Amino acid sequence: QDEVIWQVVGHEFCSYRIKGEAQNFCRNEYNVTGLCNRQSCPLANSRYATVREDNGKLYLYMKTIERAHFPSKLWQRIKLSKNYAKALEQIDQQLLYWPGRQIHRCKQRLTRLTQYLLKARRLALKHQPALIPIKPKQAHREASRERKA
């Protein structure tokens, strides 16, 4: 299963892969790191855990090998508390006896997703200029009309 899956998706063709000069990336939604790796692949790891943000709330998504053949019921999620200390405890207790590498990666994604939510809230309170696109046809027209004017 997983080893055959990786030999196909990891080395022949994955629609989620973005080839880069120094490291390949994975546009899969369930990748914890965002990189194309053997341990980062949600396709090639039947026991996977990730943290994702849904309309301002963070969730711990987990899948087990026993639900691999049921795509609708494959991933299960729990709501992670807004208290960062308790969110770490919930990751620890939901991922009990999982490899420490996977708990390490979910705790890293929880930090970055908590930081992104903090920065997003700080930008909302702040006042920043709107970005006005420059229209080439309008610029050409007003440049020629101005010369005639």
């Binding site: 899956i5 030999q7 196909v8 022949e12 063709f13 629609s15 691999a68 053949h69 795509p71 609708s72």
Partner: protein
């Protein structure tokens, strides 16, 4: 080994039924991405039409001259593949369609499909209207793939659109049926959906682009007939004379299970470290670094170089015989 035993059937309203089909042996066949790609490369050349310049046309450098080595029609357009190799690739491409992870890596939006392999009732075989076809695809949540194909319709980049290849798009689900009593015409107008008979499966459809893992929807009758089309490794196929499913050179392809098993981990020697620490990054001179000198020589602590052995009673030792020889001539 140790695959899922049975496959559930889904009615036309999208709900699970109480009937299950034993998983056919073809889904246990080895998945051979190298072998599927090679057969696909050859099989995709078998519908090419010849091209060549006119014989009367035309030095290759002179303007309005003759092109060097003019193209000819008797080029090799069609390429042979052993029938067993074609059957191996088709069996390996049916097996890959039963893995949800290979479906996702091929671009199929099967994230809400209820089960893979997806088998529906035989009442689907008699759908007459595209409305019935779309409603079924929406009940089993397989319409996300069709929406993906519709959104992907673009104008082809290049001279291809000058040559009756105006538009490009994605591949949707592949509906496989037993008998056509309306199913083909109900699904053919849906963008990306291809409908094929289970008796004549096409590797150009099971591995589009040479990429394994097409999303396939079977009817109940097509799924039940998969064991006659392909057979097993020990029983011959009924619909292919003297054909057996290929055997694999590995029994349990999970090699991490073998490496990290109690059978093997109980005899291996104690594993050395992972990435090791660097020893002697910098060379330090014992004649300058006194700490390195004490490490190499556990005697420099008590050395006592300048000892005094002479005194004020030095017996100058040079006889008159030697002095006479020295002060001679």
């Amino acid at each position: 080994a140790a695959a899922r035993p049975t496959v559930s059937i889904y009615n036309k309203d999208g709900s699970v039924s109480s009937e299950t089909l034993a998983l056919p042996f073809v889904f246990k066949a080895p998945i051979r991405p190298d072998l599927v790609r090679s057969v696909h490369t050859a099989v995709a050349k078998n519908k090419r039409q010849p091209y060549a310049v006119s014989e009367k046309a035309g030095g290759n450098m002179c303007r309005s001259g003759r092109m060097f080595a003019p193209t000819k029609t008797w080029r090799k357009w069609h390429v042979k593949v052993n029938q067993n190799e074609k059957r191996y690739a088709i069996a390996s491409a049916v097996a890959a369609s039963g893995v949800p992870s290979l479906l996702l890596a091929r671009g199929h939006r099967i994230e809400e499909i209820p089960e893979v392999p997806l088998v529906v009732d035989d009442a689907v075989q008699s759908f007459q209207k595209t409305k019935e076809a779309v409603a079924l695809l929406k009940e089993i949540k397989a319409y996300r793939d069709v929406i993906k194909v519709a959104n992907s319709r673009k104008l082809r980049a290049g001279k291809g659109k000058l040559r009756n290849r105006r538009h490009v798009q994605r591949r949707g689900p592949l509906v496989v049926f037993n008998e056509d009593t309306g199913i083909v015409k109900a699904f053919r107008n849906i963008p990306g959906v291809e409908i094929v008979n289970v008796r004549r499966l096409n590797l150009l459809q099971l591995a589009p682009g040479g990429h394994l893992g097409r999303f396939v929807i079977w009817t109940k009758s097509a799924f039940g007939l998969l064991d006659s089309v392909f057979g097993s490794t020990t029983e011959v196929a009924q619909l292919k004379k003297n054909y057996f499913l290929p055997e694999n050179i590995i029994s349990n392809a999970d090699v991490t299970r073998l490496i990290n098993s109690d059978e093997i981990q109980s005899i291996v020697k104690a594993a050395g470290p992972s990435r090791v620490k660097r020893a002697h990054v910098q060379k330090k001179n014992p004649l300058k670094n006194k700490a390195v000198l004490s490490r190499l020589n556990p005697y420099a602590k008590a050395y006592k170089a300048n000892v005094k052995i002479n005194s004020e009673k030095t017996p100058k030792a040079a006889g008159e015989k030697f002095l006479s020889v020295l002060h001679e001539n």
